Design a protein around this ligand. Structure first.
Ligand SMILES: O=C(N1CCc2sccc2C1)n1ccnc1
Length: 125
Protein backbone atom coordinates (compact mmCIF):
# COMPACT_ATOMS: atom_id res chain seq x y z
CA UNK A 1 0.00 0.00 0.00
CA UNK A 2 1.10 3.47 -1.12
CA UNK A 3 1.01 6.64 1.05
CA UNK A 4 -0.01 9.95 -0.49
CA UNK A 5 2.96 11.43 -2.40
CA UNK A 6 4.90 14.36 -0.86
CA UNK A 7 3.38 17.79 -1.41
CA UNK A 8 4.49 19.81 -4.37
CA UNK A 9 2.67 22.99 -3.26
CA UNK A 10 1.90 24.50 0.11
CA UNK A 11 0.00 27.82 0.13
CA UNK A 12 1.09 28.85 3.57
CA UNK A 13 4.80 28.16 2.89
CA UNK A 14 6.61 31.16 1.34
CA UNK A 15 8.06 30.75 -2.15
CA UNK A 16 11.32 31.99 -3.56
CA UNK A 17 13.29 31.95 -6.78
CA UNK A 18 17.07 32.29 -6.64
CA UNK A 19 19.82 31.81 -9.19
CA UNK A 20 20.88 28.63 -7.34
CA UNK A 21 17.36 27.17 -7.40
CA UNK A 22 17.03 27.96 -11.13
CA UNK A 23 20.36 26.18 -11.75
CA UNK A 24 19.21 23.18 -9.68
CA UNK A 25 16.27 22.77 -12.05
CA UNK A 26 17.77 23.72 -15.42
CA UNK A 27 21.14 22.10 -15.02
CA UNK A 28 21.33 19.72 -12.10
CA UNK A 29 17.92 17.97 -12.04
CA UNK A 30 17.42 18.04 -15.81
CA UNK A 31 20.84 16.58 -16.42
CA UNK A 32 20.50 13.83 -13.77
CA UNK A 33 17.07 12.98 -15.27
CA UNK A 34 18.74 11.90 -18.52
CA UNK A 35 21.13 9.50 -16.98
CA UNK A 36 20.64 5.85 -17.72
CA UNK A 37 20.20 5.10 -14.01
CA UNK A 38 17.67 7.89 -13.30
CA UNK A 39 14.47 5.94 -14.02
CA UNK A 40 13.90 4.40 -10.59
CA UNK A 41 14.04 7.90 -9.08
CA UNK A 42 11.78 9.78 -11.51
CA UNK A 43 8.62 9.07 -9.47
CA UNK A 44 7.55 8.04 -6.02
CA UNK A 45 8.31 4.40 -5.25
CA UNK A 46 5.16 2.44 -6.17
CA UNK A 47 5.03 -0.27 -3.56
CA UNK A 48 1.78 -1.79 -5.01
CA UNK A 49 3.19 -1.89 -8.61
CA UNK A 50 6.72 -3.02 -7.54
CA UNK A 51 5.49 -5.60 -5.05
CA UNK A 52 7.30 -3.91 -2.16
CA UNK A 53 4.74 -3.91 0.63
CA UNK A 54 7.35 -3.19 3.31
CA UNK A 55 8.91 -0.12 1.53
CA UNK A 56 6.78 2.45 3.42
CA UNK A 57 6.95 0.39 6.57
CA UNK A 58 10.63 1.26 6.50
CA UNK A 59 10.93 4.61 4.63
CA UNK A 60 9.01 7.36 6.48
CA UNK A 61 10.20 10.42 4.58
CA UNK A 62 9.83 9.46 0.93
CA UNK A 63 11.39 11.56 -1.82
CA UNK A 64 11.91 11.27 -5.61
CA UNK A 65 13.08 13.44 -8.50
CA UNK A 66 9.62 13.84 -9.94
CA UNK A 67 8.51 15.50 -6.74
CA UNK A 68 11.68 17.62 -6.62
CA UNK A 69 11.17 18.71 -10.19
CA UNK A 70 7.52 19.76 -9.48
CA UNK A 71 8.72 21.61 -6.34
CA UNK A 72 11.32 23.46 -8.30
CA UNK A 73 8.77 24.22 -11.07
CA UNK A 74 6.34 25.60 -8.44
CA UNK A 75 9.03 27.76 -6.61
CA UNK A 76 8.16 25.65 -3.54
CA UNK A 77 11.61 26.00 -1.95
CA UNK A 78 12.96 29.02 -0.10
CA UNK A 79 16.59 28.19 -0.97
CA UNK A 80 18.98 25.72 -2.68
CA UNK A 81 19.87 24.00 0.59
CA UNK A 82 16.25 22.95 1.07
CA UNK A 83 16.24 21.36 -2.39
CA UNK A 84 19.60 19.75 -1.92
CA UNK A 85 18.26 18.18 1.29
CA UNK A 86 15.42 16.55 -0.67
CA UNK A 87 18.03 15.00 -3.06
CA UNK A 88 20.00 13.76 -0.07
CA UNK A 89 16.78 12.25 1.43
CA UNK A 90 16.08 10.47 -1.87
CA UNK A 91 19.58 8.92 -1.97
CA UNK A 92 19.62 8.02 1.72
CA UNK A 93 16.21 6.30 1.46
CA UNK A 94 17.59 4.03 -1.22
CA UNK A 95 20.58 3.14 1.00
CA UNK A 96 18.37 2.45 3.97
CA UNK A 97 15.85 0.15 2.16
CA UNK A 98 18.60 -1.74 0.19
CA UNK A 99 22.06 -3.23 0.83
CA UNK A 100 25.48 -2.39 -0.54
CA UNK A 101 26.01 -4.00 -3.97
CA UNK A 102 22.29 -4.18 -4.83
CA UNK A 103 21.61 -3.02 -8.36
CA UNK A 104 19.36 -0.15 -7.21
CA UNK A 105 22.11 0.97 -4.80
CA UNK A 106 24.72 1.03 -7.56
CA UNK A 107 22.36 3.27 -9.55
CA UNK A 108 21.87 5.60 -6.55
CA UNK A 109 25.67 5.72 -5.86
CA UNK A 110 26.36 6.78 -9.45
CA UNK A 111 23.65 9.45 -9.40
CA UNK A 112 24.80 10.76 -6.08
CA UNK A 113 28.35 11.17 -7.39
CA UNK A 114 27.08 13.02 -10.43
CA UNK A 115 24.82 15.15 -8.20
CA UNK A 116 27.69 16.15 -5.97
CA UNK A 117 29.87 17.00 -8.92
CA UNK A 118 27.17 19.36 -10.19
CA UNK A 119 26.41 21.10 -6.91
CA UNK A 120 30.09 21.55 -5.92
CA UNK A 121 29.87 24.89 -7.61
CA UNK A 122 26.67 26.84 -7.82
CA UNK A 123 25.92 30.22 -9.29
CA UNK A 124 26.23 33.35 -7.16
CA UNK A 125 23.02 35.17 -6.01
O1 LIG B 1 14.01 -1.94 -4.85
C1 LIG B 1 13.69 -1.03 -5.69
N1 LIG B 1 13.68 0.32 -5.13
C2 LIG B 1 14.08 0.33 -3.75
C3 LIG B 1 14.44 1.53 -3.08
C4 LIG B 1 14.34 2.75 -3.94
S1 LIG B 1 14.65 4.27 -3.40
C5 LIG B 1 14.33 5.07 -4.85
C6 LIG B 1 13.87 4.15 -5.90
C7 LIG B 1 13.87 2.74 -5.30
C8 LIG B 1 13.42 1.47 -5.96
N2 LIG B 1 13.35 -1.39 -7.12
C9 LIG B 1 13.34 -2.67 -7.60
C10 LIG B 1 12.98 -2.59 -8.94
N3 LIG B 1 12.83 -1.31 -9.32
C11 LIG B 1 13.04 -0.58 -8.18
Amino acid sequence: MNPPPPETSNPNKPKRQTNQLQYLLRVVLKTLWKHQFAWPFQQPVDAVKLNLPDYYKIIKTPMDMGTIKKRLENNYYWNAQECIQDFNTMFTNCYIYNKPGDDIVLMAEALEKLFLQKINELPTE
